[PDB]
TrEMBL record, chain B:
This is Capsid protein. Signal peptide: none annotated. The chain holds residues 300 to 357 of 590 of the full protein. The lineage of its organism: Viruses, Riboviria, Orthornavirae, Pisuviricota, Duplopiviricetes.
From TrEMBL, chain D:
This is Capsid protein. The chain holds residues 125 to 182 of 590 of the full protein. It comes from the Viruses. It comes from Rabbit picobirnavirus.
Amino acid sequence: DWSWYAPSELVAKQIANVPFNVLAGTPIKASVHLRYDPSLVSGLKDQLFVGNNASIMGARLLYLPSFGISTTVLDGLSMAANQLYAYVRKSNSGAKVYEAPDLMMTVLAIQEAYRVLFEIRRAITFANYWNFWNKYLPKQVFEQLLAIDFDDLMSNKANYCAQFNLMAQKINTFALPKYFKSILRMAYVSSNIFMDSDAVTGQMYAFVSSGYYRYSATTSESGTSLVYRDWPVGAAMPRKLNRLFTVLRELLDAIYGDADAQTMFGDIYKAFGSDGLYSIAEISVDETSTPVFDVDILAQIENCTILEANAGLAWTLDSCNVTQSKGQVLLWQPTGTITSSDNTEHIAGDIAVALGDRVLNSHIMEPQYSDVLEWTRLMATIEFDKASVTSSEKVTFKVTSCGAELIRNVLYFKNVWNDAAEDASQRVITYFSHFSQITVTNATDDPTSAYGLMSNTLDFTQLDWHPIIYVTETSVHNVANLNSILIGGDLKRPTVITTDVVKRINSAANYALYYSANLLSNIST
Amino acid sequence: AAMPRKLNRLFTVLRELLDAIYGDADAQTMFGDIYKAFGSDGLYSIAEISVDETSTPV
Amino acid sequence: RLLYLPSFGISTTVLDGLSMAANQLYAYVRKSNSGAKVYEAPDLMMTVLAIQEAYRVLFEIRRAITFANYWNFWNKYLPKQVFEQLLAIDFDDLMSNKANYCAQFNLMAQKINTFA
Amino acid sequence: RLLYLPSFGISTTVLDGLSMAANQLYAYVRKSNSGAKVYEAPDLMMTVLAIQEAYRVL
């Protein structure tokens, strides 16, 4: 009780008055006094350390759009493709024109097209959110969290809005059944920005597609297929919007160039009414959305799994395309390669990592199956291909399973200050810091040593709900002479899931995203 | 007279079983044509079951 | 244990079971359709059976689970033993994974329901 | 004074009751549980009895 430290209320209202005028992006000039013997310390000069780091801005979740590891006809896509082509032939008659996969493929292409368009919606809808208290916001966030040239967007807010609504109308002419619960997902995921707390001065997370998908018509060998090219994103130039459109252009030029294409849409319309197709609402220069505080989404994160488990290493990713088997089964399963940050070709003396049996943390005492399902699929599993490996080789791996979005890497930003510096543009640098999910005791934020695995700058704790950090300890450091692992993260009601269990659930969850039981249940004689 | 088979083997076989029925180019378009013939009410389908469902010898 | 071979009934002439059904079946379908021909009658009827036989398996699985909990004090064979010999199913494995197995089943039921 | 030795019923068979009972219990626990086989039937039963005998002292 505060009443304890003051006589009358009125008197208290006067002795504790402290200003919280230290805006978001400004530096936290906190000080630590020091005392040592100058002749025994390498080069440290003063004996007073004034801070110059602002509270962390937030974190960028670079994800790979996913349909859920697909290897058998049982998996998500293949199944949906099935009931879909059905519902369509249902209303049609006569000669066959296109195979089932070739159709379903087209649909996805359209979905992934909207993915891009949506991130663009996000881009504009948020171009006007300003909240005095947080200087990061307006701009900075776009630059780092979304990877979008704010100045360019702000300066052309008019034309960009228009070019958008144009898209919305033009894409509306590309059939797409509004029943696919998967849409609702990606839509929500890349349409907002989430807060780690009900406070604006708090840090915030954002999801960002690391790429897109164009349709690649039946060449001569590979039957029709869906190609994936990378967003040139991670630590490069913070892309202007004209690049996001010029890509969408390319994206539909693909979906459209297929001889069968059009006649497909028609057949689709004949199946579901205009009321059965998705379409986004147009927006005005004034539309402004707000950061949101979704507990569930945070939880999804805290639990998730980072593919690039430790930024100290060099990661790769191939075979991300979506093909169709000789027997009409839709296939997708990304494979990658883990190598050392020095000899980009070998692994040498470094150690590859991926977690199997992982933790699951509930922020509710009595959790329930319902909450489990939701708080999961954001976490995935990686399996190594080879039994064991050599210093001269590469570490090969397949992705056994995962959720709707595959978390590739995660970066948290904060700008460091330095008033009085030559170039004005550089008195405030917005530096990033890699977030590694798996690490080791006695690790340093310098790749250089520690078997190739770096630790995380303790900054990260600023992110309430940050994903679980798993630290490995040699039998040496452990109090039980046996080596195990230490857990990091705000635990409340934790529990463990098997690599096997996770596989199960995702292999299932995704199936749901692309299926509707209601669909083939009301068709009469 | 061999090993008393686990269920995962009965599913892993069914998997294979429908992968077959499904891989035919004509396949799908067949189903559609079927639905257009008999209503959803004209097709077989089994009811789902719960962990507690227990049948009795008859 | 009655080890049986699923049968459609010895078929040598067009008169026999399958051939006949295949006939009236493809009919009832073309009835509601129109235009270009896409698949022959047999190729169709064949598909159907394949689906039936698929359910055969699924069903024996239903049996497997639906009976995983029958216990009648008086008969120690039941619970387990019977599965092992009469049904040829690893009881311990099923009992231990009753949850996931139930689910994987219902999944099938929904997915196969999309096979006319 | 009746000095008795706590008994579970002379059992030496995959069928001698006590084991039956074990499988029985185990099934009900694992019943609607989604985790993975982390311990066989007896492993569990064993634990329970341990608790029981503890009470016999208390």
